[PDB]
């Protein structure tokens with residue numbers, strides 16, 4: 001689990017969105033595994049606007065932050081799961097790092113700010129949904 005809190009937005013994995021998220025919906029995209037809802041309180045996270053390919057992510061199944069090198073956002077095949085059928089997920093970045101299903105939502109960050117959240121993984125891989133192209137997260 002986990003979310004990004006920027007401005008008056010909450011960014012979560014679409015597959016983990018709550019009823020309150022759906023009832024306060026701003027934007028969602030199944031092909032990216034992302035959903036954004038509106039918040040009453042202002043958040044403290046800032047979004048990175050950069051070209052970094054190295055950063056640090058939070059792994060809840062280890063209670064630890066790990067440095068990683070990650071691929072550029074791209075269209076990657078993700079196996080059928082209990083949340084989606086076998087499909088291509090867009091704007092996904094892969095790295096070598098520990099992950100388990102419940103690690104979705106952990107933040108990936110660089111020196112510029114938040115880059116994305118854990119969205120996929122398996123066998124010593126972890127995948128992150130990029131948010132750096134979502135420029136509107138920085139405005140009302």
Ligand SMILES: COc1ccccc1[C@H](OC)C(=O)N1CCC[C@H](C(N)=O)C1
Pocket residue numbers: 015033078081082083084089099100101102103104118119120121122123
């Ligand atoms: C962090 O997730 C894992 C880590 C290690 C092993 C397995 C997983 C997850 O179960 C397969 C996984 O990759 N997904 C399940 C939830 C929806 C994700 C998606 N964005 O399509 C895919």
Ligand SMILES: [Zn+2]
Pocket residue numbers: 048049050051052110111112113
């Ligand atoms: Zn950066």
